[PDB]
Amino acid sequence: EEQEEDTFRELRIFLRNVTHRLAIDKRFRVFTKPVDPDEVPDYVTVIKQPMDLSSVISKIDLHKYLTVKDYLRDIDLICSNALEYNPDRDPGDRLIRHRACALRDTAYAIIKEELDEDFEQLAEEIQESR
């Protein structure tokens, strides 16, 4: 009963804190806002599910993540979108692709270091029964 929602409240606070650390990292500025179809008109022809850190924050606040796993799915989507969309020619292209990997690696490192595995396992199993 009441305890299931304290897990989720605590997960959201943790996720808010991780996302804020990612979003203020200068390396990841390019991921803090949606890709702009006016600037990149062909983006929608490559990427079916856009994702960025400001959307991740909105999703946290709107209770769209019940697990760190679903949260990392969206981090992963940000990275995999950047790798699928951006070619590997220019230095600017390489830079944004490396940044996308570094975003994923940093989120995973933070979560590996700070997240209690039994707290995550509880989250996942509450999500299951529901």
């Binding site: 990149v40 062909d42 490559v46 969309y85 590997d88 220019d90 292209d93």
Partner: peptide
């Protein structure tokens, strides 16, 4: 891949 940004 897409065209690329910039």
């Amino acid at each position: 891949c897409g065209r690329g940004k910039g």
